[PDB]
Design a protein around this ligand. Structure first.
Ligand SMILES: Cc1cn([C@H]2C[C@H](O)[C@@H](COP(=O)(O)CP(=O)(O)NP(=O)(O)O)O2)c(=O)[nH]c1=O
Ligand SMILES: [Cl-]
Ligand SMILES: [Mg+2]
Ligand code: NA
Ligand code: NA
Ligand code: NA
Length: 326
DNA sequence: CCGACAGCGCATCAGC
DNA sequence: GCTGATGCGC
DNA sequence: GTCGG
C-alpha cells in the first residue's frame, strides 16, 4: 500500500470512464496502470518515475505529478461534484445495473436508493436482488467465513454425488485474508469435452444448496454457470451473517487446469497472461490453450496436465496463485 | 501513426 | 420459435 | 489511455 493514494485515484478514474463515459478501453487502461503501480515496491516520487512502468503513459504521469504535488486531482474533484456523474456511478453499484441502465434510470428521474426502492417493478430480476442486498454485497468476507462456506459447499456437493469435485477459486484460492464473494469451480466425470453423459449436473448441486438454505437467491442460471446469493447459518440469538454473492462454474473435467487457471484470476492477471499468450502465438480461454495459425485462426487444443503446462507453453515461469493478485 | 486491447456465460431484446 | 446484437457479469 | 511495430 505504498502508493495507495495514486492507485485509488486511478481506480476512481477507471470507474468514471467505465460507468459514465462508457469508454471501456480507458477503463482497462486505468486499471492496468493501477495494477502495475500497486505492485511497484517503492513509494513513487514522480510521474516520470511511474512512467517507466508498462501501462503508465504521459497522461497518467501528469496526473500523478498533480496528485503528488497537491494530494488531489482537479479532474476528479469536478467529477465528484457533477450530479449526473455521481448518480450514474451510484446506481452502477447495484448488481445488474450497468452503465447503460444507470443512465436510463437517471433519465427517468430514478437516481437514489430511495427511488429504486419505490420503483422495484422497473427492475429486472437480477437488479431486484441486487437492490435487496445492496448493503450486504459491499461488505467484505473474512477468510474465516470463507472457510466455513467452503466446508458447507464441499460437503453438500459430496452428498449429491461423491464424484463431484468442488474447488473454491477467486481471491480465496490466491490466499486472500478477505474476499468479495465466493467462486466455486465444479467438475463431474460425466461432463467432459467429449460428452455430457448426465443432465442437470449443475442444477442438482444448486438444488441441494437451496434445500439446506445455503443458497437463498438466484441472479442467473444456465447449464454451466450459476450466479446467486448465499448465507452462512447463524447460531441461537446470533445476528445473521450478511448475504454473500456466489458464482459456480461447471467445467468439463478434462479441462480442469484451464478452468482453475481462469477462475483463480485475478481478472487483470488473466488479461495480462492471455495478452502474453497472444504475443507468443497462443490463445487461452477457460477450456483450452490453442496455437494461432499464420492467419490468426486457433488450432487444436494442446495437451495440458497441470496449471504449469499452460505457463510453460507461453514461456512464463510458474506463478503460484498467491502471486497472481494483480 | 494507429490498430488492438482476453475471452466467454446468461438475460434481454429486435427482427424475422 | 430461432438468430444475432447488446448489456452485464465472471 | 497505452503500446508495439
Ligand atoms: C471479473 C472477472 C473475473 N474473471 C475470473 C478471474 C477472477 O479471479 C475470478 C473471480 O472473479 P471475481 O469477480 O469474483 C474477482 P476475485 O478474483 O474472485 N476477487 P474478489 O471476488 O474477492 O473480489 O473470475 C475474469 O477472468 N475476468 C473478469 O473480468
Ligand atoms: Cl474507450
Ligand atoms: Mg471472487
Ligand atoms: Na510506461
Ligand atoms: Na452494477
Ligand atoms: Na465471483
Amino acid at each position: 500500500t505504498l502508493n495507495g493514494g495514486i492507485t485509488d485515484m486511478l481506480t476512481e478514474l477507471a470507474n468514471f470512464e467505465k460507468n459514465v463515459s462508457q469508454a471501456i478501453h480507458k477503463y482497462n487502461a486505468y486499471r492496468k496502470a493501477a495494477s502495475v503501480i500497486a505492485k511497484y515496491p517503492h513509494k513513487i516520487k514522480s510521474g516520470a518515475e511511474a512512467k517507466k512502468l508498462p501501462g503508465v503513459g504521459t497522461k497518467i504521469a501528469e496526473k500523478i505529478d498533480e496528485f503528488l504535488a497537491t494530494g488531489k486531482l482537479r479532474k476528479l474533484e469536478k467529477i465528484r461534484q457533477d450530479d449526473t456523474s455521481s448518480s450514474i456511478n451510484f446506481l452502477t453499484r447495484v448488481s445488474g445495473i450497468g452503465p447503460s441502465a444507470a443512465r436510463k434510470f437517471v433519465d427517468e428521474g430514478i437516481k437514489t436508493l430511495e427511488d429504486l426502492r419505490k420503483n422495484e417493478d422497473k427492475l429486472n430480476h437480477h437488479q431486484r436482488i441486487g437492490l435487496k442486498y445492496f448493503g450486504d454485497f459491499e461488505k467484505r468476507i473474512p477468510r474465516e467465513e470463507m472457510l466455513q462456506m467452503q466446508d458447507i459447499v464441499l460437503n453438500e456437493v459430496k452428498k449429491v454425488d461423491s464424484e463431484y469435485i468442488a474447488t473454491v477459486c477467486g481471491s480465496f484460492r490466491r490466499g486472500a485474508e478477505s474476499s468479495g464473494d465466493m467462486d466455486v469451480l465444479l467438475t463431474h466425470p460425466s461432463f467432459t469435452s467429449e460428452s455430457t453423459k448426465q443432465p442437470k449436473l449443475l442444477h442438482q448441486v444448486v438444488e441441494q444448496l437451496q434445500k439446506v438454505h445455503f443458497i437463498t437467491d438466484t441472479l442467473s442460471k444456465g447449464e454451466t454457470k450459476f450466479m446467486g446469493v448465499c448465507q452462512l447459518p447463524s447460531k441461537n440469538d446470533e445476528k445473521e451473517y450478511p448475504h454473500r454473492r456466489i458464482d459456480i462454474r461447471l467445467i468439463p473435467k478434462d479441462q480442469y487446469y484451464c478452468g482453475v487457471l481462469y477462475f483463480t484470476g485475478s481478472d487483470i492477471f488473466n488479461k495480462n497472461m492471455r495478452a502474453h499468450a497472444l504475443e507468443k502465438g497462443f490463445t487461452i480461454n477457460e477450456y483450452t490453450i490453442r496455437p494461432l495459425g499464420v492467419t490468426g485462426v486457433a488450432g487444436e487444443p494442446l495437451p495440458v496436465d497441470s496449471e504449469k503446462d499452460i505457463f510453460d507453453y507461453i514461456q512464463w515461469k510458474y506463478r503460484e496463485p498467491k502471486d497472481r493478485s494483480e
